[PDB]
Write a protein that binds this ligand. Structure first.
Ligand SMILES: [Zn+2]
Ligand SMILES: [Zn+2]
Ligand SMILES: [Zn+2]
Ligand SMILES: [Zn+2]
Length: 102
């Protein structure tokens, strides 16, 4: 995976900022954000989600079907947000807006 060629619209600074926030919420340090870690992240950002809501959020970008977010799927959230590809009521749009990145 090459984030610079996959997401050339992201500055190096934004990529580093997104890596930092991925690592912040991967509490278990396994390289993924699972449902429980996303639950905690959404609470901390000020947009708590239901259990099924969190599952729907992950499913939107879960390209390898494992029910958790890899770093490349996390970046995809922000790519979709900036490209106008998330619905106005998606928990993913709340995640991107309330992350206070950019
Ligand atoms: Zn994890
Ligand atoms: Zn749950
Ligand atoms: Zn469940
Ligand atoms: Zn996944």
């Amino acid at each position: 995976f090459n984030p610079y060629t996959e997401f050339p619209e992201f500055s190096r600074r934004l990529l580093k900022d997104l890596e930092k926030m991925f690592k912040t919420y991967d509490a278990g340090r396994d390289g993924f954000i699972d449902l429980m870690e996303l639950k905690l992240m959404m609470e901390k950002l000020g947009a708590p989600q239901t259990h099924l809501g969190l599952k729907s959020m992950i499913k939107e970008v879960d390209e390898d079907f494992d029910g958790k977010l890899s770093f490349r799927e996390f970046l995809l959230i922000f790519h979709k947000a900036a490209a106008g590809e998330l619905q106005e009521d998606s928990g993913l749009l709340a995640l991107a807006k309330f992350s206070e990145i950019d």
